[PDB]
Amino acid sequence: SWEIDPKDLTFLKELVKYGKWRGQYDVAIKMIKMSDEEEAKVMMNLSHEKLVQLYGVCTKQRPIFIITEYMANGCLLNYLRERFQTQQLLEMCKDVCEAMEYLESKQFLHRDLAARNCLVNDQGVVKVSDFGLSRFPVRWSPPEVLMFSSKSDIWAFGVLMWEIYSLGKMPYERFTNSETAEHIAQGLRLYRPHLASEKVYTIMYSCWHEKADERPTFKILLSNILDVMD
Amino acid sequence: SWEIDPKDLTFLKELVKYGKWRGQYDVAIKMIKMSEDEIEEAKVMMNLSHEKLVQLYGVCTKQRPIFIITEYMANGCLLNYLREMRHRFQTQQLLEMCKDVCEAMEYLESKQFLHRDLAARNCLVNDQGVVKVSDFGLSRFPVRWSPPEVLMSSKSDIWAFGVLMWEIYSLGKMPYERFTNSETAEHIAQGLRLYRPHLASEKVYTIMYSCWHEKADERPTFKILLSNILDVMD
Ligand SMILES: *CCC(=O)Nc1cccc(-c2n[nH]c(NCc3c(F)cccc3Cl)n2)c1
Ligand SMILES: *CCC(=O)Nc1cccc(-c2n[nH]c(NCc3c(F)cccc3Cl)n2)c1
């Protein structure tokens, strides 16, 4: 049903690679080395405009391919660093939050939610991947992780907001992974970037309660982001 | 690019028709009787993109008449699905139906599109139960779904969306069924509104009732409705 014929795949350049599907369509394609490891039955059921769209797979012979939409602006971390306005930055945030809200509603977790692992289409729209979901990247991890539930993605998302409004800085750049994890436990948090209003920082900051059961749901972050957008 | 060769389409039964595209896929097929100049719509369907919009698959333009192919939404239009399934829902599910539509409509509002007839008859429901709206026939007087300023922009749809909430939570009841259209207009001009259905909580109905300010500019945007709704869902 989703089985693509590699006859129909023309390969174009490493970046995971740019390719064409049936000669027409712009696609990105990935080639497994990892083992058997059931993921894609998640990708095949999940369905949201802010997730990287699955086009198909090549399993009927070896090695394996996954084909997705070509997000022509690449990864967000670079896109930030490569012109913006604070409303655009707030949409970028909205986009990720929608995806994550959807994922949250279906009891899934991202587990490495950062700007390098976000992705940007030709229309500037930011999407997240549904491949590799769960059901220790130090600077995106909450206290309870540095010593698997909804609220660690929330922490990660708070930092992603910081990442965005920073135009892509190394978060806590001053410190090592060790000092960062120490300092995080002291109560140190990320300082309000220049480009975020007080209203914005409040969203990102609400993600960083030392207690996971005080942090908002994506549900509420999205609600909070809608609110500011006017 | 979106051109579908009608070789590859089957025409199984009316419902707009159900068919099979390329033999594999379920589809819906709309055949026009309107013009064959007013295609200019379809570029809008082609540029919009959102899960809560009935997804466009393609068209049959090269030859006559015209066809619009969309995804099959196996549970049909919403009004009938409320009534068929009246005893099967739970109040959390009714609110998701609201969320679904509010999402579509927020996207559309964020792109300056108006629906025109936002109402439970014109929404559709897939095998999953998810609710969607058509982006065909947008713009840039169904009496019961219309605000005061229509009966004599963005907030028009808002009013209609309130009645939509009332519809869902009412399990498909005719809004203002006591009254005729002429009556209904007076009572809306009097400030009478739609009462709170059994199944709607205070928070829910507050949200639906916020769509019906006499003053359009005092009505919320779909941004705030979705926020409101997301806010309630916890
Ligand atoms: C950061 C380097 C970079 O910009 N890479 C890049 C550039 C353009 C396009 C992509 C891209 N487009 N689609 C994908 N998909 C990745 C992917 C998944 F996330 C999940 C499954 C399969 C794939 Cl191919 N990357 C990347
Ligand atoms: C209202 C009666 C009913 O139940 N109709 C019904 C039943 C099942 C499926 C559909 C359906 N599925 N897709 C569509 N698409 C409608 C459509 C648009 F909204 C816009 C352009 C083209 C089409 Cl076909 N209807 C309806």
Coordinates of C-alpha atoms and ligand atoms in Angstrom, one line a residue:
Chain A
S1 CA 0.0 0.0 0.0
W2 CA 2.8 2.4 1.0
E3 CA 5.5 0.2 -0.8
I4 CA 7.5 2.3 -3.2
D5 CA 9.4 0.8 -6.1
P6 CA 13.1 2.0 -6.0
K7 CA 12.9 2.0 -9.8
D8 CA 10.8 5.1 -9.2
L9 CA 13.4 6.8 -7.0
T10 CA 16.1 9.1 -8.5
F11 CA 18.7 10.2 -6.0
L12 CA 20.1 13.7 -6.0
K13 CA 22.4 14.7 -3.1
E14 CA 23.4 14.0 0.6
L15 CA 22.3 16.6 3.3
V16 CA 19.6 11.7 4.3
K17 CA 19.4 12.8 0.6
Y18 CA 17.4 14.9 -1.8
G19 CA 15.7 12.8 -4.5
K20 CA 12.8 12.6 -6.9
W21 CA 9.8 10.2 -6.7
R22 CA 8.2 9.1 -10.0
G23 CA 10.4 11.8 -11.7
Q24 CA 7.9 14.5 -10.7
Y25 CA 8.0 14.9 -6.9
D26 CA 10.6 16.6 -4.6
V27 CA 11.5 14.1 -1.8
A28 CA 14.0 13.6 0.9
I29 CA 15.1 10.0 1.4
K30 CA 16.9 8.2 4.3
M31 CA 18.8 4.9 4.3
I32 CA 19.1 2.7 7.4
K33 CA 22.5 1.4 8.4
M34 CA 20.4 0.2 13.7
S35 CA 18.7 -3.1 12.7
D36 CA 13.7 -5.1 12.5
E37 CA 13.2 -2.0 14.8
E38 CA 7.8 -1.4 13.8
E39 CA 8.5 2.4 14.0
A40 CA 6.9 3.2 10.7
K41 CA 3.5 1.7 11.6
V42 CA 3.4 4.8 13.8
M43 CA 4.4 7.1 10.8
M44 CA 1.8 5.4 8.7
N45 CA -1.1 6.1 11.2
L46 CA -0.1 9.5 12.5
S47 CA -1.5 12.4 10.5
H48 CA -0.8 16.2 11.0
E49 CA 0.3 19.1 8.7
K50 CA 3.2 20.0 11.1
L51 CA 4.7 16.5 11.0
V52 CA 7.1 15.6 8.2
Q53 CA 4.9 13.8 5.8
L54 CA 5.7 10.1 5.0
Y55 CA 5.6 9.4 1.3
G56 CA 6.6 5.7 1.5
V57 CA 9.2 3.0 2.1
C58 CA 11.4 0.5 0.3
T59 CA 11.4 -2.8 2.2
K60 CA 10.9 -5.5 -0.5
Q61 CA 14.7 -5.6 -0.8
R62 CA 17.8 -4.4 1.1
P63 CA 18.8 -1.9 2.4
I64 CA 15.7 0.0 3.7
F65 CA 14.5 3.4 2.6
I66 CA 12.2 6.0 4.1
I67 CA 11.0 8.8 1.8
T68 CA 9.4 12.0 3.1
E69 CA 8.4 15.5 2.0
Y70 CA 11.4 17.7 1.0
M71 CA 11.6 20.4 3.6
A72 CA 13.5 22.8 1.4
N73 CA 14.7 25.3 4.1
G74 CA 16.4 22.4 6.0
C75 CA 16.9 22.3 9.8
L76 CA 15.7 25.1 11.9
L77 CA 18.9 25.7 13.9
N78 CA 20.7 26.7 10.6
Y79 CA 17.6 28.6 9.3
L80 CA 17.6 30.8 12.4
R81 CA 21.4 31.6 11.9
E82 CA 21.3 31.9 8.2
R83 CA 15.6 38.9 8.2
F84 CA 13.1 37.8 10.8
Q85 CA 10.3 39.4 12.7
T86 CA 8.9 38.6 16.1
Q87 CA 5.6 37.5 14.6
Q88 CA 7.3 35.0 12.4
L89 CA 9.3 33.6 15.3
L90 CA 6.0 33.2 17.2
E91 CA 4.5 31.2 14.3
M92 CA 7.6 29.0 14.2
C93 CA 6.9 28.2 17.9
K94 CA 3.1 27.8 17.1
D95 CA 3.9 25.2 14.5
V96 CA 6.1 22.9 16.7
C97 CA 3.5 23.3 19.5
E98 CA 0.7 22.1 17.3
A99 CA 2.6 19.0 16.3
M100 CA 3.5 18.3 19.9
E101 CA -0.1 18.9 21.0
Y102 CA -1.2 16.3 18.5
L103 CA 1.5 13.9 19.7
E104 CA 0.7 14.7 23.3
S105 CA -3.0 13.8 22.6
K106 CA -1.9 10.3 21.3
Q107 CA 0.5 9.5 24.3
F108 CA 3.7 9.9 22.2
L109 CA 7.0 11.6 23.2
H110 CA 9.7 13.2 21.1
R111 CA 12.6 12.7 23.4
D112 CA 15.1 14.9 21.4
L113 CA 13.1 18.1 20.8
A114 CA 15.7 20.8 19.7
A115 CA 16.2 23.2 16.9
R116 CA 18.7 21.0 15.0
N117 CA 16.0 18.3 14.9
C118 CA 13.2 20.6 13.6
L119 CA 12.7 21.1 9.9
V120 CA 11.5 24.0 7.6
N121 CA 9.6 23.8 4.3
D122 CA 9.8 26.3 1.4
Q123 CA 6.8 28.3 2.8
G124 CA 8.8 28.9 6.1
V125 CA 6.6 26.4 8.0
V126 CA 8.3 24.4 10.7
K127 CA 7.8 20.7 11.3
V128 CA 8.8 17.9 13.5
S129 CA 9.4 14.2 12.7
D130 CA 7.2 11.3 13.8
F131 CA 10.1 8.8 13.3
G132 CA 11.9 7.8 16.5
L133 CA 9.1 8.6 18.9
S134 CA 8.9 7.1 22.4
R135 CA 5.5 6.0 23.7
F136 CA 20.0 12.6 27.7
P137 CA 20.7 15.6 25.5
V138 CA 21.9 17.7 28.4
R139 CA 20.8 21.3 27.7
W140 CA 17.2 20.2 26.7
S141 CA 16.7 18.0 29.7
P142 CA 14.8 18.7 32.9
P143 CA 16.2 18.2 36.4
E144 CA 14.5 14.9 36.9
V145 CA 16.0 13.6 33.7
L146 CA 19.6 14.7 34.5
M147 CA 19.5 12.4 37.6
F148 CA 9.9 9.3 30.3
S149 CA 6.6 11.4 30.7
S150 CA 4.9 14.3 28.8
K151 CA 6.6 17.0 30.8
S152 CA 10.2 16.4 29.7
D153 CA 9.2 17.3 26.2
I154 CA 7.7 20.5 27.7
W155 CA 11.1 21.4 29.2
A156 CA 12.7 20.7 25.8
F157 CA 10.1 22.8 24.1
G158 CA 10.8 25.7 26.5
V159 CA 14.4 25.6 25.4
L160 CA 13.4 25.4 21.8
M161 CA 11.5 28.6 22.3
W162 CA 14.7 30.1 23.7
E163 CA 16.6 28.7 20.8
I164 CA 14.2 30.4 18.3
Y165 CA 14.0 33.8 19.8
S166 CA 17.8 33.7 20.3
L167 CA 18.2 33.3 16.5
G168 CA 20.0 30.0 17.3
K169 CA 22.5 30.4 20.2
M170 CA 24.2 27.4 22.1
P171 CA 21.9 27.5 25.2
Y172 CA 23.7 28.0 28.5
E173 CA 26.9 28.5 26.2
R174 CA 29.0 29.8 29.1
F175 CA 28.9 26.4 30.9
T176 CA 30.0 22.8 30.3
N177 CA 27.4 20.0 30.3
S178 CA 28.4 19.3 33.9
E179 CA 28.2 22.9 35.1
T180 CA 24.9 23.3 33.2
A181 CA 23.3 20.3 34.9
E182 CA 24.6 21.5 38.3
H183 CA 23.4 25.1 37.8
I184 CA 20.0 23.9 36.4
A185 CA 19.4 22.2 39.8
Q186 CA 20.4 25.4 41.7
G187 CA 17.5 27.1 40.0
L188 CA 19.4 28.9 37.1
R189 CA 17.3 29.3 34.0
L190 CA 17.7 30.8 30.5
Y191 CA 17.7 34.6 30.4
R192 CA 15.0 36.4 28.4
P193 CA 16.3 36.8 24.8
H194 CA 16.2 40.3 23.4
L195 CA 13.5 39.4 20.9
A196 CA 10.9 37.9 23.3
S197 CA 8.4 40.2 25.0
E198 CA 7.6 39.5 28.7
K199 CA 4.5 37.7 27.4
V200 CA 6.7 35.4 25.3
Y201 CA 9.3 34.6 28.0
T202 CA 6.5 33.7 30.3
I203 CA 5.4 30.9 28.0
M204 CA 9.0 29.5 27.6
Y205 CA 9.7 29.9 31.3
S206 CA 6.5 28.2 32.4
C207 CA 8.1 25.1 30.8
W208 CA 10.9 25.0 33.4
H209 CA 9.2 24.4 36.8
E210 CA 11.5 22.1 38.8
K211 CA 8.4 20.0 39.5
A212 CA 7.1 18.3 36.3
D213 CA 3.4 18.4 37.6
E214 CA 3.4 22.2 37.5
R215 CA 4.6 22.6 33.9
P216 CA 1.8 23.1 31.4
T217 CA 0.5 20.6 28.8
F218 CA 1.1 21.4 25.1
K219 CA -2.6 22.0 25.1
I220 CA -2.0 25.0 27.4
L221 CA 1.2 26.2 25.7
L222 CA -0.6 26.3 22.4
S223 CA -3.5 28.1 24.1
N224 CA -0.9 30.5 25.6
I225 CA 0.7 31.1 22.1
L226 CA -2.6 31.7 20.3
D227 CA -3.3 34.3 23.0
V228 CA -0.1 36.4 22.4
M229 CA -0.4 36.1 18.6
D230 CA -3.0 38.9 18.8
Chain B
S1 CA 0.2 18.3 -12.0
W2 CA -3.1 17.8 -10.2
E3 CA -4.6 16.5 -13.4
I4 CA -6.3 13.1 -12.9
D5 CA -7.0 11.0 -15.9
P6 CA -10.7 9.8 -15.6
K7 CA -9.5 6.5 -17.0
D8 CA -8.3 5.8 -13.4
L9 CA -11.5 6.7 -11.6
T10 CA -14.5 4.5 -10.9
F11 CA -17.9 5.9 -10.2
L12 CA -19.6 3.7 -7.6
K13 CA -22.5 5.6 -6.0
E14 CA -24.1 9.0 -5.2
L15 CA -24.2 10.5 -1.6
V16 CA -21.3 14.0 -5.1
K17 CA -20.2 10.4 -5.5
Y18 CA -18.0 7.6 -4.0
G19 CA -15.4 6.0 -6.2
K20 CA -12.0 4.4 -6.5
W21 CA -8.9 6.3 -7.8
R22 CA -6.3 4.1 -9.6
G23 CA -8.2 1.0 -8.2
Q24 CA -6.6 1.2 -4.7
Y25 CA -7.8 4.4 -2.9
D26 CA -11.3 5.5 -1.6
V27 CA -12.3 8.9 -3.0
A28 CA -15.2 11.3 -3.3
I29 CA -16.0 12.8 -6.7
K30 CA -17.9 16.1 -7.1
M31 CA -19.4 16.8 -10.6
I32 CA -20.4 20.4 -11.5
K33 CA -23.6 20.9 -13.6
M34 CA -22.3 27.3 -11.8
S35 CA -19.8 27.6 -14.6
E36 CA -16.6 26.1 -16.2
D37 CA -14.9 29.6 -15.8
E38 CA -15.4 29.9 -12.0
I39 CA -11.3 26.5 -11.7
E40 CA -10.1 29.8 -10.2
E41 CA -11.5 28.4 -6.9
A42 CA -9.4 25.3 -7.2
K43 CA -6.0 27.1 -7.1
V44 CA -7.1 28.1 -3.5
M45 CA -7.8 24.5 -2.7
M46 CA -4.4 23.7 -4.2
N47 CA -2.4 26.2 -2.0
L48 CA -4.1 25.6 1.3
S49 CA -2.9 22.7 3.4
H50 CA -4.2 21.6 6.8
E51 CA -5.4 18.2 8.2
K52 CA -8.8 19.5 9.3
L53 CA -9.5 20.5 5.7
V54 CA -11.0 17.8 3.4
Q55 CA -7.9 17.1 1.4
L56 CA -7.9 17.7 -2.4
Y57 CA -6.6 14.8 -4.5
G58 CA -7.2 16.3 -8.0
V59 CA -9.3 17.4 -10.9
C60 CA -10.6 16.4 -14.4
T61 CA -10.2 19.7 -16.3
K62 CA -8.6 18.7 -19.7
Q63 CA -12.1 17.4 -20.6
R64 CA -15.7 18.3 -19.9
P65 CA -17.6 18.4 -17.5
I66 CA -15.3 19.1 -14.5
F67 CA -14.6 16.8 -11.5
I68 CA -13.1 17.5 -8.1
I69 CA -11.6 14.6 -6.3
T70 CA -11.2 14.7 -2.5
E71 CA -10.6 12.3 0.3
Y72 CA -13.4 9.9 1.3
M73 CA -14.8 10.9 4.7
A74 CA -16.5 7.5 5.6
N75 CA -19.0 8.9 8.2
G76 CA -20.5 11.5 6.0
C77 CA -21.7 15.0 6.8
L78 CA -21.8 15.9 10.5
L79 CA -25.5 16.6 11.0
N80 CA -26.5 13.0 10.1
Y81 CA -23.5 11.5 12.1
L82 CA -24.7 13.4 15.2
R83 CA -28.1 11.9 14.9
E84 CA -27.2 8.3 13.8
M85 CA -24.7 8.2 16.6
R86 CA -26.7 10.3 19.2
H87 CA -26.3 7.7 22.0
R88 CA -22.6 6.8 21.3
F89 CA -20.8 10.1 22.1
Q90 CA -19.3 11.4 25.3
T91 CA -18.8 15.1 26.1
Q92 CA -15.1 14.9 25.6
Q93 CA -15.7 13.7 22.1
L94 CA -18.1 16.5 21.3
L95 CA -15.5 19.0 22.3
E96 CA -12.9 17.4 20.0
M97 CA -15.4 17.8 17.2
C98 CA -15.4 21.5 18.2
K99 CA -11.6 21.6 18.3
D100 CA -11.3 20.0 14.9
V101 CA -13.5 22.6 13.3
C102 CA -12.1 25.5 15.2
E103 CA -8.6 24.5 13.9
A104 CA -9.6 24.4 10.3
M105 CA -11.3 27.8 10.8
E106 CA -8.4 29.3 12.7
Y107 CA -6.1 28.4 9.8
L108 CA -8.6 29.9 7.4
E109 CA -8.9 33.1 9.5
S110 CA -5.1 33.3 9.5
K111 CA -5.2 33.5 5.7
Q112 CA -8.3 35.9 5.4
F113 CA -10.7 33.3 4.1
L114 CA -14.4 33.1 5.1
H115 CA -16.4 29.9 5.1
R116 CA -19.9 31.3 4.1
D117 CA -22.1 28.4 5.4
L118 CA -20.4 27.1 8.5
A119 CA -22.9 24.6 9.8
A120 CA -23.2 20.9 10.8
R121 CA -24.7 19.9 7.4
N122 CA -21.5 21.2 5.6
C123 CA -18.9 19.5 7.9
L124 CA -17.6 16.0 7.3
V125 CA -16.4 13.1 9.4
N126 CA -13.8 10.4 8.5
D127 CA -13.6 6.7 9.7
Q128 CA -11.6 7.9 12.7
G129 CA -14.4 10.4 13.8
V130 CA -12.2 13.5 13.0
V131 CA -14.2 16.5 11.7
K132 CA -13.2 18.6 8.7
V133 CA -14.4 21.5 6.6
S134 CA -14.3 22.1 2.8
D135 CA -11.9 24.8 1.5
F136 CA -13.9 24.7 -1.8
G137 CA -16.3 27.6 -2.2
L138 CA -14.7 30.0 0.3
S139 CA -14.8 33.8 0.0
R140 CA -12.4 36.6 0.9
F141 CA -28.0 34.3 4.3
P142 CA -28.6 30.9 6.1
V143 CA -30.9 32.6 8.7
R144 CA -30.2 30.6 11.9
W145 CA -26.4 30.7 11.4
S146 CA -26.3 34.4 10.6
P147 CA -25.4 37.3 12.9
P148 CA -27.5 40.6 13.3
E149 CA -25.3 42.5 10.9
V150 CA -26.0 39.9 8.2
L151 CA -29.8 39.7 8.7
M152 CA -30.1 43.4 7.9
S153 CA -15.9 39.5 7.6
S154 CA -14.2 37.2 10.2
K155 CA -16.8 37.6 12.9
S156 CA -19.7 36.4 10.6
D157 CA -18.2 32.9 10.7
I158 CA -17.7 33.3 14.5
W159 CA -21.4 33.6 15.0
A160 CA -22.0 30.6 12.8
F161 CA -19.4 28.6 14.7
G162 CA -21.3 29.3 17.9
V163 CA -24.4 27.8 16.3
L164 CA -22.2 24.9 15.2
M165 CA -21.3 24.3 18.8
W166 CA -24.9 24.5 19.8
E167 CA -25.5 22.0 17.0
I168 CA -22.9 19.4 18.0
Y169 CA -23.9 19.6 21.7
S170 CA -27.6 19.4 20.7
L171 CA -27.1 16.1 18.7
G172 CA -28.3 17.7 15.5
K173 CA -31.4 19.6 16.7
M174 CA -32.7 22.4 14.4
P175 CA -31.5 25.6 16.1
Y176 CA -34.5 27.8 17.1
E177 CA -36.9 25.0 16.2
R178 CA -39.8 26.7 18.0
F179 CA -39.5 29.6 15.5
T180 CA -39.8 30.2 11.8
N181 CA -37.0 32.3 10.0
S182 CA -39.0 35.5 10.2
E183 CA -39.6 34.9 13.9
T184 CA -35.9 33.9 14.4
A185 CA -34.7 37.2 12.9
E186 CA -36.8 39.2 15.3
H187 CA -35.7 37.3 18.3
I188 CA -32.0 37.6 17.3
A189 CA -32.6 41.3 16.9
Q190 CA -34.3 41.3 20.4
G191 CA -31.1 39.8 21.8
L192 CA -32.6 36.4 22.5
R193 CA -30.1 33.7 22.0
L194 CA -29.8 29.9 21.9
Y195 CA -30.2 28.3 25.2
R196 CA -27.6 26.0 26.8
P197 CA -28.1 22.4 25.7
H198 CA -28.2 19.6 28.3
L199 CA -24.7 18.3 27.3
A200 CA -22.9 21.6 27.3
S201 CA -21.0 22.5 30.6
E202 CA -20.9 26.2 31.8
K203 CA -17.4 26.6 30.4
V204 CA -18.4 25.1 27.1
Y205 CA -21.5 27.3 26.7
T206 CA -19.7 30.3 27.9
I207 CA -17.5 29.7 24.9
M208 CA -20.4 29.2 22.5
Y209 CA -22.3 32.2 23.9
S210 CA -19.2 34.5 23.4
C211 CA -19.7 34.1 19.6
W212 CA -23.0 35.9 19.7
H213 CA -22.2 39.5 20.9
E214 CA -24.5 42.0 19.0
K215 CA -21.3 43.9 18.4
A216 CA -19.2 41.9 16.0
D217 CA -15.9 43.5 17.1
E218 CA -16.7 42.2 20.7
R219 CA -16.7 38.6 19.3
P220 CA -13.5 36.5 19.7
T221 CA -11.3 35.4 16.9
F222 CA -10.9 31.7 16.2
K223 CA -7.5 32.1 17.8
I224 CA -9.2 32.8 21.1
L225 CA -11.9 30.1 20.6
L226 CA -9.2 27.5 20.0
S227 CA -7.3 28.8 23.0
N228 CA -10.5 28.8 25.1
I229 CA -11.3 25.2 23.8
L230 CA -7.8 23.8 24.4
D231 CA -8.0 25.5 27.8
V232 CA -11.3 23.7 28.6
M233 CA -10.1 20.3 27.4
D234 CA -7.9 19.8 30.5
Ligands
LIG1 C1 20.4 20.3 9.0 C2 20.9 19.9 7.6 C3 19.7 20.1 6.7 O1 19.3 21.2 6.4 N1 19.2 18.9 6.2 C4 18.1 18.9 5.4 C5 17.9 19.8 4.3 C6 16.8 19.7 3.5 C7 15.8 18.8 3.7 C8 15.9 17.9 4.8 C9 14.9 17.0 5.0 N2 13.7 16.9 4.3 N3 13.1 15.9 4.6 C10 13.8 15.3 5.6 N4 13.3 14.2 6.3 C11 14.1 13.6 7.4 C12 13.4 12.4 7.7 C13 12.7 12.3 8.9 F1 12.7 13.2 9.7 C14 12.1 11.1 9.3 C15 12.1 10.0 8.4 C16 12.7 10.1 7.2 C17 13.4 11.3 6.8 CL1 14.2 11.4 5.3 N5 14.9 16.0 5.8 C18 17.0 18.0 5.6
LIG2 C1 -24.4 14.6 3.4 C2 -24.7 13.2 2.9 C3 -23.4 12.5 3.1 O1 -23.3 11.7 4.1 N1 -22.4 12.7 2.2 C4 -21.2 12.1 2.2 C5 -20.9 10.8 2.7 C6 -19.6 10.3 2.6 C7 -18.6 11.1 2.1 C8 -18.8 12.4 1.7 C9 -17.7 13.1 1.2 N2 -16.4 12.8 1.2 N3 -15.7 13.6 0.6 C10 -16.5 14.6 0.2 N4 -16.1 15.7 -0.4 C11 -16.9 16.8 -0.7 C12 -16.2 17.7 -1.5 C13 -15.8 19.0 -1.0 F1 -16.1 19.3 0.2 C14 -15.1 19.9 -1.8 C15 -14.8 19.5 -3.1 C16 -15.1 18.3 -3.6 C17 -15.9 17.4 -2.8 CL1 -16.3 15.8 -3.4 N5 -17.8 14.3 0.5 C18 -20.1 12.9 1.7

